[PDB]
């Protein structure tokens, strides 16, 4: 009981990618001018403040970089300590998402089976099978929240065999169609997959690409099992490695 203002930033994910981006941006703007101390935690950290003015301007800075929700709490000593609980939306970039049906229909009649493509003050999803994006806001997320299907630990490697195209691009992304194989049975089997993806302008035949393999997956998700069977694909490709040396 010696500060009078506490700000507690949390994100309930094992791999706190958005939180580490936020830490890089706080360190690269130096918004930690007037912090008394910093307490570590398992899922975030607590900043301390002598008066609540630096705390509310920290809230003002955080409300425009990351999709968050904040709540205020009042303490008594017998003059009043204040506590600001901030939660980051627990969906990071390049994560695989199944959307609620009403939200997917109201957000442009997009598919439910999407990929998180950009995180800003809001969050952005994109359909990899047909290039089409959508913007979800923090308040409409936190009105009724959901979780992600797969995080970036079960990304398996793929060896690109052949490329085609369809001509359609939406800027920075050429929607093409590529045939691919797994590097655990490329020299074993004759098993090839055909994926209509947005890694067409960036990929050429013979290299390695990360993706989700849905055909080997035990998913316990009511949003997933409420889908259809034929309209969910086998592989969702996300990113190319491309190590120079």
């Amino acid at each position: 009981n010696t500060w009078r203002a506490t700000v507690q930033i949390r994100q309930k994910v094992p791999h706190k990618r958005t939180f580490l981006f936020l830490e890089q941006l706080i360190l690269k703007h130096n918004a930690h001018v007037d912090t008394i101390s910093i307490s570590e935690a398992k899922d975030g950290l607590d900043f301390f403040y002598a008066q609540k003015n630096h705390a509310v301007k920290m809230i003002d800075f955080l409300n425009a970089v990351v999709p968050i929700k904040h709540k205020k709490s009042e303490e008594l000593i017998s003059t009043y300590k204040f506590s600001y609980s901030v939660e980051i939306v627990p969906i990071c970039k390049d994560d695989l998402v199944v959307l609620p049906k009403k939200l997917a229909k109201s957000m442009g009649n997009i598919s439910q089976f999407v990929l998180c493509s950009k995180i800003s003050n809001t969050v952005q999803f994109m359909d990899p099978t047909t290039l089409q994006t959508a913007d979800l806001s923090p308040s409409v997320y936190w009105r009724a929240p959901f979780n992600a299907l797969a995080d970036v630990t079960q990304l398996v490697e793929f060896i690109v065999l052949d490329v085609d195209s369809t001509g359609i691009s939406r800027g920075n992304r050429v929607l093409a169609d590529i045939t691919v194989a797994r590097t655990s049975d490329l020299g074993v089997n004759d098993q090839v997959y055909y994926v209509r993806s947005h890694l067409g302008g960036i990929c050429h035949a013979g290299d390695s690409v990360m993706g989700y393999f849905i055909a080997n997956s035990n998913y316990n998700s009511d949003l997933f099992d409420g889908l259809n069977i034929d309209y969910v694909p086998d592989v969702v490709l996300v990113k190319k490695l491309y190590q120079r040396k």
């Binding site: 065999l161 052949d162 490329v163 020299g187 004759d190 090839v192 055909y194």
Partner: protein, 217 residues
């Protein structure tokens, strides 16, 4: 489809084998292929399914499989008396870009070395898979003659952008009951491969490579 009392295919095979060599005794080009068109499926909206359903019965004896490999499998290919390739030969093949698009046409297939196939992905560049000639690997202790027999008798159903998949399922040579077994195996493989196990298959036709007017299926 779910199988439909195959005596109609039996009479169709008999009429096809009386069309070939009993009304036109042409030169030896026996290939009684089965063409199958599927119905009620969108190519973009549904998954592009594929498999291979290799029946040991053979109909295309004259095939070209330029075995690309190392030195030991090069000696094994020279023993098995088939067209092989070398490492410097494949390096020159990847050097001359126009030579690959021609060697993909002078050959009929390919069979690679489980020691050099994880490079044909990039060294031997694209359009080999677009011509559907990605090489199948062969190990350091498996039989090369048996692998060539399997790569000459291995049939593969792949879903393209068109719903008209045709396969060299038989020859017009002989063996009516073995041909009936081959037609049953191909129909079973297609019906199990499609999404609805019976409903999607519409068109079945037999043709003994001669534009014969005997399908009756």
């Amino acid at each position: 489809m779910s199988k439909i009392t195959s005596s109609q295919v039996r009479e169709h095979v008999k009429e096809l084998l009386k069309y070939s060599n009993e009304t036109k005794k042409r030169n030896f080009l026996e290939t009684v292929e089965l063409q199958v068109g599927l119905k009620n499926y969108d190519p973009q909206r549904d998954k592009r399914f594929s498999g291979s359903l290799k029946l040991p019965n053979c109909p295309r004896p004259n095939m070209s499989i330029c075995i690309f490999g190392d030195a030991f499998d090069v000696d094994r290919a020279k023993s098995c008396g088939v067209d092989a390739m070398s490492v410097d030969d494949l390096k020159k093949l990847n050097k001359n870009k126009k030579l690959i698009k021609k060697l993909s046409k002078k050959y009929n297939a390919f069979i690679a070395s489980e020691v050099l196939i994880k490079q044909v992905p990039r060294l031997l560049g694209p359009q080999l898979s677009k011509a559907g000639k990605f090489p199948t690997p062969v190990s350091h202790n498996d039989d090369l003659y048996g692998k060539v027999t399997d790569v000459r008798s291995t049939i593969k159903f792949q879903l393209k952008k068109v719903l008209c998949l045709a396969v060299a399922v038989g020859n017009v040579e002989m063996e009516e009951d073995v041909l009936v077994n081959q037609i049953l195996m191909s129909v079973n493989f297609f019906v199990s491969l499609l999404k609805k196990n019976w409903q999607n298959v519409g068109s079945l036709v037999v043709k003994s490579s001669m534009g014969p007017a005997f399908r009756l299926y």
